[PDB]
Design a protein around this nucleic acid. Structure first.
Lengths: 94, 116, 136, 79, 178
RNA sequence: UCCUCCUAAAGAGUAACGGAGGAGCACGAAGGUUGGCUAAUCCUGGUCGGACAUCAGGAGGUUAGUGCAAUGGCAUAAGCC
RNA sequence: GCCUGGCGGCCGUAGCGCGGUGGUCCCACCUGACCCCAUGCCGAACUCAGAAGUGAAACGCCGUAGCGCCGAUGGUAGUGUGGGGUCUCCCCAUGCGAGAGUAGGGAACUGCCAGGC
């Protein structure tokens, strides 16, 4: 069980995705739940310090974004080409 | 699939007719029936036809798969062709032989009027 | 000793390395090595590195190898001038880049590639080291 | 070694490309050694000994997307 | 030439009074024998079959024809268009006509005569009635010395299983073994 | 000297004793044309049968073949009857 | 309105597998053949004279998603144009960018005509 603070991600593309990763952030997404896809910004090393536990993937977690809070489940990951660091991650509505 | 071999022979013909466009006469038969239809110069619809389904033939013929029933359709489609004034009509045999009931239909269509 | 299957054609072209290509997910085991750099790897180097591990691991495992020689190289006499031409095949080589895992392990708990890799890294290019299994 | 030759001078390129003038006959596609990858459709045909889909009437090319999976035909437009 | 009359009266058809079949299209039917006679090493004789050209039509109710090979070089010698056999195939009335001599009078030579083994059974109940080599039937000029060749016969059925194809062995009698 | 696939750069000819090969002929038929046909390979079983032998069944198929080379295609068959 | 067939327009979200259902119009099997036509033998194939028997098979209709098929959104590889860093690679600014995978879809669409109930 976890609760994390997220922010709606409003600027997308390669150089912006690399910019986040230099400025303590990284891209992610929320989809499913019979609702439209949402793009989000997360803390780069602080979520990497969190996801290395089974209870991040075996059970739901809360995301706090857009002035509400919702439960999701972790769906997918992209790792760095030669490092365990987070490049991009997927979530699905729970 | 010996049924599909007749469809292959029809693909051969359909491709060969595709470069012609225009008004087309298609003949089709089965062990109890025979019919002939005139397809429009846009290919999208029929104009006129003749078929062993009409009680004008089907009540007078003792079997609709007969030679004289094929001639009855030939003599009807030629008569309806004269009503709609069709010329330069390309013939199509639906993958069948021309010999037999399609020839016996055509032989009588050129007896009810112009060739055909 | 490692001597790959005779090439369909008598000679090959060496080719350029892009110096990245992800391949970090272990599929012949659960753990492996860190590459994090780029260069050329030879058949004698991977057999000398296999010898270094064979001497420390005895017969445990085995260990699986995801790098194999890709090209034979043409070699000729040193005195031949510049111009004509390419010699016969001599040594076999491959290319390495940061995303490589090189070697894959699972059946060798804590006695290989868990505390150090220095003894096998001393036989190889690009100052390599071990990696821990990726589980999340 | 050597003597692989390949020889010299051969082309048959770029003649089946983009917007046409619609007032003389055109090759439509001159792709080498064509036997079934393309073929012809609609009002036009091409049966030349050099596998050219040359249309026998004056018109423009349709650049048609119809045809089964990876088999697409040389056809002339209606205007 | 009487089986044609009886095969239309009750043989594997009176079944339809006690079992759930509304037509003969769900019951066992027999209508074919794809006959052949091989030549073997005849290429090293090339003179006997040059005069015995109707010697298969002497037992089958159809027109004789020599079959030409589909092979042009072989480890036993063959040549392009060489005659490799004769068929004289039985269907319908000529098949029922031909069947009236099988097991009934084909007894001049035997090798088990109690049912051998159910080869080529196809899981349907396809029955063996071959003779390995011709045994000669009474017709005309059959009492003399004359040579004989290889002859094998399988009767194949439209049945779906040997559980239901065996309704033929419940209407006729012949020696059978699996 | 001629000829294919590739190098040759998502516009074209094209380099270096560049990469895999060929051509100086063949077939009056292996050409024209109407209608058809559909591999191969393997399994099953059938006297004379060393050993591949027959005719029929089953699996199965841009995998057979194409005068010759390399390449692209293939039943609307350009493959064979 | 639903059904059966055809000309098709279209031919990888009509495909593969799995479970039901139909003989009425239709079709397939099927009745018979030295008759028209036919087997390099065989009514198998293709005919011709057709309804005695079915819906076995093939065919049509319908359900069922494990999948071919369709497939977001984001990211990644890639990159045009400027520029950074002892530099055949890394890093950035600005403008573009897949394929594959994931969520998810999905057991065909549609115009004309004849007949059926």
């Amino acid at each position: 069980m976890f609760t994390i603070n997220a922010e709606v991600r409003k600027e997308q593309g390669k150089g912006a995705s690399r910019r986040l990763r230099a400025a303590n952030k990284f891209p992610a997404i929320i989809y499913g739940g019979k609702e439209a896809p949402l793009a989000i910004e997360l803390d780069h090393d602080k979520v990497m310090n969190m996801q290395a536990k089974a209870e991040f993937y075996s059970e739901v977690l809360t995301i706090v974004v857009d002035g509400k809070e919702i439960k999701v489940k972790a769906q997918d990951v992209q790792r760095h080409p030669y490092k365990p660091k987070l490049q991009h991650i997927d979530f699905v509505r729970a | 699939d010996k049924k599909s071999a007749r469809i292959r022979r029809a693909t051969r013909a359909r491709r060969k007719l595709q470069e012609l466009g225009a008004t087309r006469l298609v003949v089709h038969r089965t062990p109890r029936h025979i019919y002939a239809q005139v397809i429009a110069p846009n290919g999208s619809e029929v104009l006129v036809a003749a078929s062993t389904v009409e009680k004008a033939i089907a009540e007078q013929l003792k079997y609709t798969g007969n030679k004289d029933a094929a001639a009855a359709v030939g003599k009807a489609v030629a008569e309806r062709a004269l009503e709609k004034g069709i010329k330069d009509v390309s013939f199509d045999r639906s993958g069948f032989q021309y010999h037999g009931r399609v020839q016996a239909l055509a032989d009588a269509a050129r007896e009810a009027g112009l060739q055909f | 000793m490692l001597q790959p299957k005779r090439t369909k054609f008598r000679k090959m072209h060496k080719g350029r390395n892009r110096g990245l290509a992800q391949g970090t997910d272990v599929s012949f085991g659960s753990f492996g090595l860190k590459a994090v750099g780029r260069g050329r790897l030879t058949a004698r180097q991977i057999e000398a590195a296999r010898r270094a591990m064979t001497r420390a691991v005895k017969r445990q495992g085995k260990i699986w190898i995801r790098v194999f020689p890709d090209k034979p190289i043409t070699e000729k006499p040193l005195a031949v001038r510049m111009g004509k031409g390419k010699g016969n095949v001599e040594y076999w080589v491959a290319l390495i880049q940061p995303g490589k895992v090189l070697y894959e392990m699972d059946g060798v708990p804590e006695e290989l590639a868990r505390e150090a890799f220095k003894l096998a890294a001393a036989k190889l290019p690009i100052k390599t080291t071990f990696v821990t299994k990726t589980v999340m | 070694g050597g003597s692989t030759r390949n020889g010299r001078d051969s082309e048959a390129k770029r003649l089946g490309v983009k917007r046409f003038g619609g007032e003389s006959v055109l090759a439509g596609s001159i792709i080498v050694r064509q036997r079934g990858t393309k073929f012809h459709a609609g009002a036009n045909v091409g049966c030349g000994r050099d596998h050219t889909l040359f249309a026998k009437a004056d018109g423009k090319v349709k650049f048609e997307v119809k045809g089964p999976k990876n088999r697409k035909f040389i056809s002339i437009e209606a205007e | 030439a009487k089986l044609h009359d009886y095969y239309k009266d009750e043989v594997v058809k009176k079944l339809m009074t006690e079992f759930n079949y509304n037509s003969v299209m769900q019951v066992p039917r027999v209508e074919k024998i794809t006959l052949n006679m091989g030549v073997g090493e005849a290429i090293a004789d090339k003179k006997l079959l040059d005069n015995a050209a109707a010697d298969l039509a002497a037992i089958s109710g159809q027109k004789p024809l020599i079959t030409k090979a589909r092979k042009s070089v072989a480890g036993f010698k063959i040549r392009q268009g060489y005659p490799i056999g004769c068929k004289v195939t039985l269907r319908g009335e000529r098949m029922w006509e031909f069947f009236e001599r099988l097991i009934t009078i084909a007894v001049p030579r035997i090798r088990d005569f109690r049912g051998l083994s159910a080869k080529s059974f196809d899981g349907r109940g396809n029955y063996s009635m071959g003779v390995r080599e011709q045994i000669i039937f009474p017709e005309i000029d059959y009492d003399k010395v004359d040579r004989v060749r290889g002859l094998d016969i399988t009767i194949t059925t439209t049945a779906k299983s040997d559980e239901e194809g065996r309704a033929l062995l419940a209407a006729f009698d012949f020696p059978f073994r699996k």
